[PDB]
Structure 1
Amino acid sequence: TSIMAVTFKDGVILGADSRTTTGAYIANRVTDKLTRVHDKIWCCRSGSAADTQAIADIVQYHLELYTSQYGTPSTETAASVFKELCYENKDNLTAGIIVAGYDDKNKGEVYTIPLGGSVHKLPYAIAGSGSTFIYGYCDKNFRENMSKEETVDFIKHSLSQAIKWDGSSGGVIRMVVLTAAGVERLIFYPDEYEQL
């Protein structure tokens, strides 16, 4: 798996590959790893599919109940609920979640939650097995306040490299754009991104 989320001028973009393997066999080549927990709060999932699916569903439940009582939750609050579940059940979970969201006040935000259940607010985040190969690339190429098109290009170039080298990554590059305008689903096929 190769996943990332990048803040930019207008908000935030989540990116992911679509490959899930059991050993060397690709059990799913069109997986959707970009998961909605609220209107404009989404997450990228890595680790045990069972675990991250269960986590995300519980988080989505909490934020639905939060909204009913107290109105729209902040991205921080969503990250806090992920953290609470991951940290308190660290012995029985293998989950690496990136939480990304947009609200009008704070703009775009990215919180990464590694294996232990710690939380780290970052300008951008990368995770999944494929991410190791793009630490160098991303650190030399990321800039703050990029445009939507620049950010889409940064994610597309980054994940294409992660996919190129990581066997556990592949398929299509999915993105989810989060801004004041709303939510936009993007998808990029092998014939485009391999050529980069």
Structure 2
Amino acid sequence: TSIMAVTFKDGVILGADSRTTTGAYIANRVTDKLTRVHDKIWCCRSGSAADTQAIADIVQYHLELYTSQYGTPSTETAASVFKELCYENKDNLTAGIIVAGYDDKNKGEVYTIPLGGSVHKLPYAIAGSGSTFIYGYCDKNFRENMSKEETVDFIKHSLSQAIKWDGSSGGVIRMVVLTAAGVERLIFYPDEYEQL
């Protein structure tokens, strides 16, 4: 699994591969690991597919009910609800989730929630089996306040390398852009990103 979220000038972009493997068999080569818990709060999923889907579905329910009562929730609030589920059920869960969202007040924010259930607010986050191979690259190449086009290139190049080396990652590179302008989905095929 190769997943990442990166903050930039206009907001935040989530990125992910599309491979789902049962051992060495690719069960699904066109998986969507970028999932929506609110209009402009999305998450990247890694670990158990069942666990991360179940968690994400519960979070979406909580934020839908939150919105009905108290209006639009913050990205921090969404991350807290993810944490609460991941921390309190740490013994029975295998979930590594990156939460990313866009407020107008706070702009682009990224929170990573690893296995333990801890929360870490970061400028950008990487996770999944394929992330190990791009710690060096991402650290050397990340800058704060990048443009949309630069951030797309940064994610595309990063996940391209993660896919290249990690057998558990592959397929298409899906991306979701979160800004004031709205929500934009992007897709990049093997023939495009492999030759980078």
Q: TM-score, normalised by structure 2?
A: 1.00
Deviation at 1:92, TM superposition (A): 0.1
Once residues 123 and 43 of structure 2 are traced to their aligned partners in structure 1, the CA distance between those partners, rounded to angstroms, is 15
Once residues 19 and 11 of structure 1 are traced to their aligned partners in structure 2, the CA distance between those partners, rounded to angstroms, is 27
Q: Which residue of 2 is the match for residue 74 of structure 1?
A: 74
* Moved segments of 4+, more than 3 Å: none
Once residues 20 and 163 of structure 1 are traced to their aligned partners in structure 2, the CA distance between those partners, rounded to angstroms, is 12
**What whole-Å deviation, never above 9, does each CA across 1:64-86 have from its counterpart, x for those lacking one?**
00000000000000000000000
Deviation at 1:177, TM superposition (A): 0.1
Structure 1: which 5+ residue stretches go unaligned? none
Map 1:114-153 → 2, pairs under 5 A: 114-153=114-153
Once residues 73 and 176 of structure 1 are traced to their aligned partners in structure 2, the CA distance between those partners, rounded to angstroms, is 19
Q: Which residue of 2 is the match for residue 35 of structure 1?
A: 35
Deviation at 1:89, TM superposition (A): 0.1
Deviation at 1:157, TM superposition (A): 0.1
Structure 2: which 5+ residue stretches go unaligned? none
Secondary structure in 2 matching 1:79: helix
Deviation at 1:178, TM superposition (A): 0.0
Q: CA RMSD in A?
A: 0.1
Once residues 149 and 33 of structure 1 are traced to their aligned partners in structure 2, the CA distance between those partners, rounded to angstroms, is 22
Deviation at 1:122, TM superposition (A): 0.1
Deviation at 1:100, TM superposition (A): 0.1
Once residues 132 and 184 of structure 1 are traced to their aligned partners in structure 2, the CA distance between those partners, rounded to angstroms, is 28
Deviation at 1:181, TM superposition (A): 0.1
**What whole-Å deviation, never above 9, does each CA across 1:142-191 have from its counterpart, x for those lacking one?**
00000000000000000000000000000000000000000000000000
How many residues were matched structurally?
196
Once residues 192 and 175 of structure 1 are traced to their aligned partners in structure 2, the CA distance between those partners, rounded to angstroms, is 14
Once residues 44 and 172 of structure 1 are traced to their aligned partners in structure 2, the CA distance between those partners, rounded to angstroms, is 15
Deviation at 1:127, TM superposition (A): 0.1
Identity rate, percent: 100
**What whole-Å deviation, never above 9, does each CA across 1:126-147 have from its counterpart, x for those lacking one?**
0000000000000000000000
Deviation at 1:39, TM superposition (A): 0.1
Secondary structure in 1 matching 2:91: helix
Secondary structure in 1 matching 2:51: helix
Deviation at 1:193, TM superposition (A): 0.2
Deviation at 1:30, TM superposition (A): 0.1
Once residues 116 and 144 of structure 1 are traced to their aligned partners in structure 2, the CA distance between those partners, rounded to angstroms, is 28
Map 1:7-156 → 2, pairs under 5 A: 7-156=7-156
Deviation at 1:16, TM superposition (A): 0.1
Q: TM-score, normalised by structure 1?
A: 1.00
Secondary structure in 2 matching 1:31: coil
Deviation at 1:194, TM superposition (A): 0.2
